[PDB]
Amino acid sequence: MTPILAAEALTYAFPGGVKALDDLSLAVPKGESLAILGPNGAGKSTLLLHLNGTLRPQSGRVLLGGTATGHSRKDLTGWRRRVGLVLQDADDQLFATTVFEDVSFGPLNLGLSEAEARARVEEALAALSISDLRDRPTHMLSGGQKRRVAIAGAVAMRPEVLLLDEPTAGLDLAGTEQLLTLLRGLRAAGMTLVFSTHDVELAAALADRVALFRTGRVLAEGAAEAVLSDRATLAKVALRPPLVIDLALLARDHGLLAPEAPLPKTRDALAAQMAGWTRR
Amino acid sequence: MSIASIDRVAAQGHWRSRPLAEKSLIGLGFLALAVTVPPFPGAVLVTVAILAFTFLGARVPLRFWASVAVLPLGFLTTGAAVLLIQIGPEGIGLAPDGPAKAAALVMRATAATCCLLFLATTTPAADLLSGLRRWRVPAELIEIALLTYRFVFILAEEAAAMTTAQRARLGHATRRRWLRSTAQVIAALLPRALTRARRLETGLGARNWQGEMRVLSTRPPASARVLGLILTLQAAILAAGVL
């Protein structure tokens, strides 16, 4: 199955000199959740900005549906119609004045009619449970509500792929759980999610596949199960496993947990293993 | 903060959703009257008219309205007394129709100031800017205006948080330090506004074009019916006041 989205040999340097993306290759299978995991400054965001056509690379190419993307204004429209992007700071993509008006913007830019735009806005607001916010002035929104207005704004265009830059940033637990539910729903309607984060916990909750990122390079890539337990490989991008598995592997080091089996992934499963411990 | 004060009342207010054309003929209609109709029978009619709509129509919190309705009073008493005092040959004394003209200025002015306060507290500025669409004013001038209004609140909170920082250190100890402290905030605010503009440029691109910013409002159309009703209650008051 050709990837619905792919990077081949991507190289990008700022007009400073340093290379943000370094001979990068990545494939996004259709329908799955892909975390781009890695520390601050690894150029994960720079990679997202390529994948929706905002940035041109020095070398390499972005493949859409198996076809090399172009740069006609007609070409670039379908690239944005099909690959959506949500920046970290929602205020960088709301120019707004009200929530409804802000979400209307995308549809109108796709050559859609008002009636079609107005319908797209309703679908979007519904899909993100902010329909009652339809007329709230955008500056009078919480941080979380602003991230939900920004996603509603992207999904009003109907992308196949939604790119999310650090989507949980700044959120409390409750806020994280609501967003996770809404994201999972979008994955459920067959939307492909690619998100970048330095939070292994976000990757743990939302990702099917994981790509370890460091200094403009994909360092490793595999099933979320495989990557998030690789204590050794995570160590090289300055990360640790999700807290449950890390403590479970802390239990394994001291021999409390047998090896070659059953790493606890949920917290309660980890508590369940404490019953075997005794003391010395 | 004080920037957002009037703006939230017109954001959160009972008449928030009422049609812009209806609100804006009340405001700009009576306002037109207040400046044209001779003060005594004229301005008083408008004042009670608009004070109705601000309280009969919308229900603007009056404590709030008071707070906003005062500052004018200060600039105002001054004019009234200047009208009252006379200057020339013999020097400085009491003018002939001083109290006549001072009273007339105070009346014409508080009536107009109530009309303005009506728009500001019931209809958001953004909506008014949009209402410029049906006048001939070009789309890019409206768009710049809407986006400015949006930038105002982002910058206002940055200005606020910046004045807090300066204070947290001792930027406001001596008047000397205070003037210079405000100055550094101003100069540091501008690069922040400009980088905001560049970043938005990128952000809006994720949805196709940056510039050319067409947005769909959810404003209701009103009725040629109450605009019929409003249009010569404003010619009712109009001539009952010009007699």
């Binding site: - | 400046v35 105002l76 004019g79 200047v82 200057i87 009309c115 890019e140």
Partner: protein
């Protein structure tokens, strides 16, 4: 500062709107020119106006015993030179009317003429004259902000005078009257504003 709402009769109100309109249309047209050439000038223009507004709302201690808000006439003129200012001046004024209660809509026009137009035009002339006569950046900027301000306050005080000629003395009479009474607050303002905008341009160059 501004002439409050309905402080001016309809004939003077319209008169000032007509007198300001040619300059306002001038700047409007320049803007539409740069926006077609550079579409992102929508954003940067909106940033320039919002900046102009927020600073006009900040808190400045006076030379005298009052408390005031800077009136970025000089600054805007020196940083966003004048045609553009006539246009964003109109915008800043509108929001000061609709957001702070400060302006006036019937007086927007009278106000547009002095602060926007005139205010920038003096500040800018004075900026370039001082410079070419040898003034350092700091002194040029101070004469720009101080005389620009002073000019809006002179313009405003005349417009009022035109509107309210005193019975004994004529326009001349009222000019002296409005002028001397508003001097009590405004010349300390014009001076402090001068101090203020110098420290900004300094800091700005540093950045």
């Amino acid at each position: 500062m501004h002439i409050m709402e309905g402080y001016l009769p309809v004939t003077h109100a319209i008169g000032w709107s007509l007198a300001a309109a040619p300059f306002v249309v001038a700047g409007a047209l320049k803007i539409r020119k740069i926006v077609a050439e550079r579409p992102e000038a929508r954003m940067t223009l909106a940033a320039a106006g919002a900046f102009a507004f927020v600073l006009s709302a900040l808190k400045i201690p006076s030379v005298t015993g009052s408390c005031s808000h800077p009136t970025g006439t000089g600054l805007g003129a020196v940083v966003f030179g004048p045609s553009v200012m006539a246009v964003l001046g109109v915008i800043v004024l509108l929001f000061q009317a609709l957001l702070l209660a400060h302006g006036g809509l019937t007086t927007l026009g009278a106000n547009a003429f002095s602060m926007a137009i005139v205010g920038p035009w003096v500040a800018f002339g004075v900026y370039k004259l001082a410079g070419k006569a040898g003034a350092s950046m700091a002194v040029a900027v101070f004469l720009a902000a101080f005389l620009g301000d002073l000019a809006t306050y002179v313009t405003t005080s005349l417009q009022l005078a035109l509107a309210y000629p005193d019975p004994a003395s004529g326009f001349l009479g009222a000019a002296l009257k409005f002028g001397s009474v508003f001097a009590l607050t405004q010349i300390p303002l014009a001076i402090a504003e001068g101090f203020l905008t110098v420290i900004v341009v300094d800091a700005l160059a540093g950045k």
